[PDB]
């Protein structure tokens, strides 16, 4: 239904706007106005979407189709509309009952009352399918429909019959009757319930009402002497100024037609209670409210700093590199570090400092955490398969840590997160400075989600993981290390891990991280591609090529 | 930014609502009111989200992470805000320039004018950091800030000085000055630009203004005799009734403070041009508008009929079945048909008639269409691989039609849709009654998307595809058929195809379709599971078991 309700709103607003446009033009240039019946077109326009006419002029293998969650939109849209119509229906009925009450309590007029009405309407031979009644229960005129078109006038106006107030009242309310405004109002009012999903129904009923009163004024002017026009306007003002103003009913017409500013102001004057409120009233409210604002300040807010990249300086000595030739077709950034010299070597430092979600490379942390916490071990580095198929054929099997890491088997790693107390992981994120340390709410929060780290930070953290972390065992450090070997020669053993930030089928994060153990030094590094085809494989190739050219993988 | 703008709106509305609540209570029960300065808290509340304080109390394998398209939300939210603030800034400046003009055009008062102001404010020793000016360019009082708090009074009120209008005007505007309302208004006004993303800024400036006028009224009552209270209210009305009403400025205070209904009505009376507009004006507009409504009727609308299942009768003779034992754990529906008898056999007909997207089973139509149209053939039943990895390991290869169909290789089939003129496909959807024949906009529209078909329709269409379709070659019919063989014995050859409606990792459509060629008859069928584990594999198992029990796969 949500789509239909929306389409209805669109249809409605289209027509509605066109009419507003015309309304403007007609008055602005010609002193012309719309015949309000035209507004029925907006209602009709919004009913169009609901008219059912096609009018115009073996091997079991499968993938996951990612559709929008419409159930959570249409189930609620349906309910929202239903509840509201019930509420509005009640409001309507309440108003209806009011009208019925008055109908029951309506009084008949005698010949010395009826003749005033006749005097007023007679000259234009207005129709007799109208009802005039009086009452002791009202302060100012009220119209009613009932197929009768009743004008109920407070009985006091049958005493105050020497100031022409009735002339204006009757012609005014009469005009509404003439044009069946009350009825039409009711019809629209009913439709405002039916079509309550579209707030413009209220907007238009209001505009209609405003204009209905205007047309009535036009009528009255047509029915009065030019030298009484001023009087009429004054009368209109008196009809509101001298009375209490309440929306006692939303169906009938009356002088007090809207929640105006004057309404509020004038009532306050009538209720001239010149009491100075205690200063403490607002001291309390203001501080209370302030504290409630504080409560809002106790809650989630954003920070430009969080959105930002490593804005921090590097505390270590470093050199800036130019490796743009190697990045070539896949622009990015790169960080290398020398353990012996405590020196960093950074390509495009501004970019090196940019934080990206780790993707699959985080799995080394996830797995090694499981190892230290005694969740995952060597004898039991393995995880059971749930027999659910996964994204690569390579993943549809049981596996140990070396296999799981080598083939990036997400299943293996999903279970590892589930099997490790989250607080263990959170503790390590904090202790070893894991980028923004943002664990999100996702068990695999690093997988193109909430946790982000720069290449510089990635190098710092891994290096410290082995070099400094005193809250992590030697076995976990080494067991993990062996699973990452890429290549080796007479100078070194190169270790690392790739991952691809692939989202909605496109590449966004070309990750490759690692370290090198050589026969002269130890190096740490991180590569990230953002442009071209920023895949994990390209990052691997790029990193190796760089490290070799820089002497890391070539003896210098 | 969208998230922040939203958070701001939320923060704002929270506080705002609390204040509205208090406002209600204070007046409703005590005749007390908020000190409008409190509304600064809503502005502050909406600024909170922007405060950057973390306050509270290798083998390359990868999968696709399906994230929400925030770029299309934040890029626009940013622009929307920027454009609007520019517009509002202009509007502000326009208002500012107006005020500057008046400042430049302000006139000084002489001693016989100044003494009136003094008479009015003197008794309460009101401060002199106020400016009184007069002008020939205005009709009613206007306030200005400039750090001066200027009250500009039309020069005519210095002639009409024997009716106490000034008493009320000055005290009223003075009160606004006393409380620095103009300034605060301006500040809020400036913030309504800054925080324009939140429409409540306008709501509150309005509420503030309304209440500012109220506080001024309270002040005035505090500063006048009780027997003048009535006069004051009348004066307020005169200050609007007897003047043109225009929002000449949105910063200054004036008598004509809002776009009221009375405003509109009274102007219309002043402009008492009693011209009957031609009837043709609205005949045109109404019909035009109608035709524009028709234009909306020329457009997309929904149909309950489209949303509905096969509401149609079956034109063929049939028997209703009870196979609930076999469905068992995976409730659904099932249709079988006898070619010799022209009879249908239907389990849960109400459910059999339900339409579901075909999933991978549609591929038989897609492929056979390619065959007839001479896009795909036998010698060239094959399709090249684009070297992109696909959802199953089974799919990461080149393939012919038999392999592609047997392993559901979506890639193969995606290319087939791309290689077949869409009109060929559309023609066949129409000619052979393919369910709702809805081709969507998706090249693979049948894959848990727009095309839907019932099991009954699935049986009818496939049967007719071979039995009746005279716009489709024999080779395409048979080539496709061979690729579907499941099993055979001394009575028959069973053919078919599965597919699984898996969405966001869950099973929704357990499809299996097919036919049986026996040594006595020919049968057609379609199975669909909706409950339990409605997988394509279960559908295959269920269908076979049913067909055998029914005699289809067992000689009867
Ligand atoms: Zn009226
Ligand atoms: Zn004022």
From TrEMBL, chains A, B:
It comes from the Bacteria. This is BlaR1. It comes from Staphylococcus aureus. One of its GO terms (molecular function) is penicillin binding. The chain crosses the membrane at residues 6-26, 38-57, 79-99, 143-162, 182-200, 280-301. Keywords: Membrane, Plasmid, Transmembrane, Transmembrane helix. Residues 4-269 form the Peptidase M56 domain. InterPro entries: Beta-lactam/transpept-like, Beta-lactam_resp_regulator, PCN-bd_Tpept, Peptidase_M56.
């Amino acid at each position: 239904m949500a789509k239909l309700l929306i389409m209805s709103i669109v249809s409605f607003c289209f027509i509605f706007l066109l009419l507003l446009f015309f309304r403007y033009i007609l008055k602005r240039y010609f002193n012309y106005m719309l015949n309000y019946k035209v507004w029925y077109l907006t209602l009709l326009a919004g009913l169009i979407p609901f008219i059912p006419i096609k009018f115009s002029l073996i091997q079991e293998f499968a993938t996951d189709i990612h559709k929008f969650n419409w159930d959570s939109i249409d189930n609620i849209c349906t309910v929202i509309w239903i509840v509201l119509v019930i509420i509005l229906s009640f409001k309507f009925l309440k108003a209806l009952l009011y009208l019925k009450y008055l109908k029951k309590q309506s009084l008949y007029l005698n010949e010395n009352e009826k003749n005033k009405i006749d005097t007023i309407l007679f000259n234009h031979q207005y129709k007799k399918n109208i009802v005039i009644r009086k009452a002791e229960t009202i302060q100012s005129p009220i119209t009613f429909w009932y197929g009768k078109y009743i004008i109920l006038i407070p009985s006091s106006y049958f005493k105050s019959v020497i100031d022409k107030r009735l002339k204006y009242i009757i012609l005014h309310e009469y005009a509404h009757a003439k044009n069946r405004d009350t009825l039409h109002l009711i019809i629209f009012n009913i439709f405002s319930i039916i079509m309550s999903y579209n707030p413009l129904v209220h907007i238009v009923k209001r505009k209609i009402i405003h204009d209905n009163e205007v047309e009535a004024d036009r009528f009255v002017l047509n029915n009065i002497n030019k030298n009484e026009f001023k009087t009429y306007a004054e009368s209109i003002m008196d009809s509101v100024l001298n009375v209490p103003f309440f929306n006692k009913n939303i169906l009938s017409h009356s002088a007090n037609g809207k929640k105006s500013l004057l309404k509020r102001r004038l009532i306050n004057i009538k209720e001239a209670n010149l009491k100075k409120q205690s200063k403490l009233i607002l001291i309390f409210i203001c501080i209370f409210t302030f504290l409630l604002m504080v409560i809002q300040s106790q809650f989630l807010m954003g920070q430009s700093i969080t959105d930002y990249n490593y804005k921090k300086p590097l505390h270590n000595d470093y050199q800036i590199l130019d490796k743009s030739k190697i990045f070539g077709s896949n622009s990015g950034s790169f960080v290398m570090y020398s353990m012996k010299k405590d020196k960093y070597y950074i390509y495009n430092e501004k970019e090196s400092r940019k934080r990206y979600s780790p993707n699959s490379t985080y799995k080394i942390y996830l797995a090694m955490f499981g190892l230290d916490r005694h969740i995952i071990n060597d004898e039991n580095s393995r995880m059971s398969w749930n027999h659910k198929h996964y994204p690569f054929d390579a993943w549809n099997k049981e596996q140990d840590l070396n296999t799981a890491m080598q083939n990036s088997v997400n299943w293996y790693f999903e279970r590892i997160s589930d099997q490790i107390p989250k607080n263990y992981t959170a503790t390590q994120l904090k202790q070893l400075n894991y980028g923004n340390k943002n664990l999100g709410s996702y068990k695999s929060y690093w997988m193109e989600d909430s946790l982000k780290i720069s290449n510089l930070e990635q190098v710092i953290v891994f290096k410290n993981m082995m070099e400094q972390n005193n809250h992590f065992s030697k076995k976990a450090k080494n067991q993990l290390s062996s699973s990452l070997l890429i290549k080796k020669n007479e100078k070194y053993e190169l270790y690392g891990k790739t991952g691809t930030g692939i989202v909605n089928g496109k590449y966004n994060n070309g990750w490759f991280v690692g370290y090198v153990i050589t026969n002269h030094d130890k190096y740490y590094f991180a590569t990230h591609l953002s442009d071209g085809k920023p895949s994990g494989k390209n990052a691997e190739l790029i990193s190796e090529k760089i490290l070799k050219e820089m002497g890391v993988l070539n003896g210098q």
